[PDB]
Amino acid sequence: AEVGLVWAQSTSGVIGRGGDIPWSVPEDLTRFKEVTMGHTVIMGRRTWESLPAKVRPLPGRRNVVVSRRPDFVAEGARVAGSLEAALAYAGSDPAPWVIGGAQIYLLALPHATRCEVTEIEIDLRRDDDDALAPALDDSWVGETGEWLASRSGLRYRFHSYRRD
């Protein structure tokens, strides 16, 4: 099983602020759908909460929420008490995806063999309570696309990385 991580970050490494994603780049949500469609999507409890209620569970995917609380309620999702448990509920899924947030990416990173990153050209100065992207060392190899204009007026680009 190829455990993948998918996220969007500013160039500075911010993925979340004030419980939200601090930009609007539609092309990123489209990409996210394209990558994750048909697979398990594993998320931390706070990410689950960040999603608008009507958008969740994410359709066409098996949703899993990681919590320490074995009685946590996620309507339309399986709740798991660890990342290892989350990966077990993925079953025979050949390519489960971890979809955030900061805490869960760090948990998953040792299992991961693929990362799909959208970089957003926005000037965000890291605050103390920002959610931050994991750093990838050079065991990770891949390709970086060209800068693209979003409908938003910001630029973005895709990075695809893998390791054995």
Ligand X SMILES: NC(=O)C1=CN([C@@H]2O[C@H](COP(=O)(O)OP(=O)(O)OC[C@H]3O[C@@H](n4cnc5c(N)ncnc54)[C@H](OP(=O)(O)O)[C@@H]3O)[C@@H](O)[C@H]2O)C=CC1
Please state the residue numbers annotated as binding site.
Answer: 8, 15, 19-20, 45-47, 50, 67-69, 101-104
Per-residue x/- track, 18-57, ligand X (CB under 6 A): -xxx---------------------xxxxx--x-------
10 binds ligand TOP (CB under 6 A): no
CA distance 60 to 47: 18
Q: For ligand TOP, give the closer residue by CB, 28 or 130.
A: 28
Contact 138, 151 (CB under 8 A): no
Return all residues near 101 (Cβ < 8 A) that are at least 6 apart.
Answer: 15, 16, 43, 44, 46, 47, 50, 131
- H-run or E-run covering 108: helix 102-108
Report helix, strand or coil for 62: strand
Contact 140, 13 (CB under 8 A): no
- 57 contacts which partner out of ligand X, ligand TOP, none, CB within 5 to 8 A by kind? none
Q: What residues make contact with ligand X under the rule CB under 6 A?
A: 7-8, 15-16, 19-21, 43-47, 50, 66-69, 72, 81-82, 99-104, 107, 131
Q: What residues make contact with ligand TOP under the rule CB under 6 A?
A: 6-8, 21, 28-29, 32, 47, 50-51, 99-100, 118
